[PDB]
Amino acid sequence: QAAMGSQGNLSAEVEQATRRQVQGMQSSQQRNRERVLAQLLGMVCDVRPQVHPNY
Amino acid sequence: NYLSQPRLTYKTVSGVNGPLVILDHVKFPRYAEIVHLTLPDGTKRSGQVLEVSGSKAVVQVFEGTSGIDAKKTSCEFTGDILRTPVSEDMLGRVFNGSGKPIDRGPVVLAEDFLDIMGQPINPQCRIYPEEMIQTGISAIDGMNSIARGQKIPIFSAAGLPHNEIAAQICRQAGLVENFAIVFAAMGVNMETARFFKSDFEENGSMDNVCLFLNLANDPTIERIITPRLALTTAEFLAYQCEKHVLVILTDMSSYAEALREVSAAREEVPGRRGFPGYMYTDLATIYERAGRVEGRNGSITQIPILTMPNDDITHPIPDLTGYITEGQIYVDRQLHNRQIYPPINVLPSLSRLMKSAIGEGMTRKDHADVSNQLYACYAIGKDVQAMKAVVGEEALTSDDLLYLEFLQKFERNFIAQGPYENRTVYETLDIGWQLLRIFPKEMLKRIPQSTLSEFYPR
Amino acid sequence: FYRLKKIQEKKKILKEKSD
Amino acid sequence: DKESTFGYVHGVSGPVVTACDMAGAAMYELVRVGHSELVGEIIRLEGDMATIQVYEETSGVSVGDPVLRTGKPLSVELGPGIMGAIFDGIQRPLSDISSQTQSIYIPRGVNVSALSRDVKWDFTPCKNLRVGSHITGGDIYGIVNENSLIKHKIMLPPRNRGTVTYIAPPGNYDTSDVVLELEFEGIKEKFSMVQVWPVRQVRPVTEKLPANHPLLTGQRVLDALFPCVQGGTTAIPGAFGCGKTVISQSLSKYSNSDVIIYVGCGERGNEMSEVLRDFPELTMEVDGKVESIMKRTALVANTSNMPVAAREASIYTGITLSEYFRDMGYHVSMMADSTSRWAEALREISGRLAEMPADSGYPAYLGARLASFYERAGRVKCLGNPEREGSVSIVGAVSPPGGDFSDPVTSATLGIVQVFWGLDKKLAQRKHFPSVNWLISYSKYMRALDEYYDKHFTEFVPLRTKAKEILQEEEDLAEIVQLVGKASLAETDKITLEVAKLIKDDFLQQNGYTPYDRFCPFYKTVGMLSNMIAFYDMARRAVETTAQSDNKITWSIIREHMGEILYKLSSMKFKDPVKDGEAKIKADYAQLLEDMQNAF
Ligand SMILES: Nc1ncnc2c1ncn2[C@@H]1O[C@H](COP(=O)(O)OP(=O)(O)O)[C@@H](O)[C@H]1O
Ligand SMILES: [Mg+2]
Using alpha carbons, list the distances in angstroms from residue D346 to D16, D53, D350, D358, D366.
12, 11, 6, 12, 8
Chain C residues within an 8 Å CB radius of D356? 3, 6
Rounded to whole angstroms, the Cα distance separating B357 from B355 reads 6
CB pair distance less than 8 Å for B270 and C9: no
Q: How many CB atoms lie within 10 A of CB B393?
A: 9
Rounded to whole angstroms, the Cα distance separating D52 from D33 reads 9
Give the angle subtended at the CA of B319 by the CAs of B313 and B322, to the nearest 5°: 110
Rounded to whole angstroms, the Cα distance separating D266 from D345 reads 9
**Is the distance from CB of B208 to CB of B178 less than 8 angstroms?**
yes
**Is the distance from CB of D547 to CB of D490 less than 8 angstroms?**
no
Chain A residues within an 8 Å CB radius of B28? 52, 54
Ligand 1 atom with the shortest distance to the CA of B350: 27
Q: How many CB atoms lie within 10 A of CB A11?
A: 9
- Residue B199 CA to ligand 1 centre (angstroms): 36
Domains of chain D by residue range: 1-74, 75-118+192-443, 119-191, 444-600
**Is the distance from CB of D294 to CB of D276 less than 8 angstroms?**
yes
**Phi, psi (deg, nearest 5) at residue B11:** -110, 30
Touching partners of A (3+ C-beta pairs < 8 Å): B, D
Atom 3, ligand 1: residue with shortest CA distance: D511
Rounded to whole angstroms, the Cα distance separating B156 from B164 reads 12
Q: What is the DSSP-derived secondary structure letter of residue B6?
A: P
Number of residues assigned to chain C: 19
DSSP D24-81: SPPTTEEEEETTTTEEEEEEEEETTEEEEEESS--TT-BTT-EEEEEEEESEEEESSS
Residues near A8 by Cβ (< 8 Å), separated by ≥ 6?
none
DSSP D293-337: GGGGEEEEEE-TTS-STHHHHHHHHHHHHHHHTTTTT-EEEEEES
Residue type, D449: L
Rounded to whole angstroms, the Cα distance separating B200 from B92 reads 10
Dmax (CA) for chain B in angstroms is 85
Rounded to whole angstroms, the Cα distance separating D374 from D419 reads 12
**Element housing D140 (H / E):** strand D140-145
Rounded to whole angstroms, the Cα distance separating B269 from D360 reads 9
Number of residues assigned to chain A: 55
Helix and strand counts by DSSP (H, E) for chain C: 1, 0
Ligand 1 lining (C-beta closer than 6 Å): B 352, 355; D 240-246, 433, 511-513
Interface A–B counts its CB contacts (< 8 A) at: 6
Rounded to whole angstroms, the Cα distance separating B296 from B232 reads 17
Q: What resolution, expressed in A, was reported for this entry? A: 3.6
- Residue D114 CA to ligand 1 centre (angstroms): 33
Mapping DSSP to helix (H, G, I), strand (E, B) and coil, where does residue D237 land?
coil
Assign residue D108 a region (left: φ > 0; alpha: ψ between -120 and 50; beta: otherwise).
left
CA neighbor of D239 nearest in space, from D109, D458, D426? D426
CB pair distance less than 8 Å for D62 and A55: no
- Give the closest ligand to the alpha carbon of residue D243: 1
Residue type, D150: I
**D65 — contact with chain A (CB < 8 Å)?**
yes
Rounded to whole angstroms, the Cα distance separating B193 from D483 reads 50
Chain D residues within an 8 Å CB radius of A55? 64
Rounded to whole angstroms, the Cα distance separating D530 from D522 reads 12
Using alpha carbons, list the distances in angstroms from residue D54 to B215, B315, D14, D28.
37, 31, 9, 12
- Report the DSSP pairing between strands D259-265 and D331-336: parallel
Give the N- to C-terminal CA distance of chain B in Å, as an integer. 68
Q: C18 vs chain D: nearest CA distance in angstroms?
A: 19
CA neighbor of D532 nearest in space, from D512, D503, D555? D503
Assign residue D536 a region (left: φ > 0; alpha: ψ between -120 and 50; beta: otherwise).
alpha
**Element housing B182 (H / E):** strand B180-188
**C2 — contact with chain B (CB < 8 Å)?**
yes
Mapping DSSP to helix (H, G, I), strand (E, B) and coil, where does residue D594 land?
helix
Beta strands, E only, D412-516:
419-420, 442-443
Torsion of CA B339, B343, B345, B348, to 10 degrees: 140
Torsion of CA D528, D533, D534, D539, to 10 degrees: 130
Number of residues assigned to chain D: 600
Q: What is the DSSP-derived secondary structure letter of residue C19?
A: -
Long-range contacts (CB closer than 8 Å, 24 or more residues apart) made by D155-162: D155/D195, D155/D327, D155/D328, D155/D384, D156/D180, D156/D191, D156/D384, D157/D191, D157/D195, D157/D197, D158/D203, D158/D204, D158/D383, D160/D184, D160/D189, D161/D134, D161/D135, D161/D136, D161/D137, D162/D134, D162/D135, D162/D189
Residue type, B91: L
Query: Which candidate in D56, D104, D249 is best for mutational testing of the B interface (most B CBs within 10 A)?
Result: D104
**Phi, psi (deg, nearest 5) at residue D548:** -140, -25
Q: B210 vs chain A: nearest CA distance in angstroms?
A: 21
Residues near D555 by Cβ (< 8 Å), separated by ≥ 6?
D491, D494, D495, D539, D542, D543
Rounded to whole angstroms, the Cα distance separating D240 from B314 reads 11
Identify which of B319, B350, B356 to mutate to test ligand 1's pocket (most ligand atoms within 8 A of the CB).
Answer: B350
| Residue numbers preceding breaks in chain B (C to N > 2.5 A) | 176
Return the residue of D nearest to C7 by Cα: D356
**Element housing D109 (H / E):** none
Rounded to whole angstroms, the Cα distance separating D23 from D2 reads 10
Return the residue of C nearest to B267 by Cα: C2
Mapping DSSP to helix (H, G, I), strand (E, B) and coil, where does residue D493 land?
helix
- Residue B327 CA to ligand 2 centre (angstroms): 11
CA neighbor of D39 nearest in space, from D8, D62, D11, D17? D17
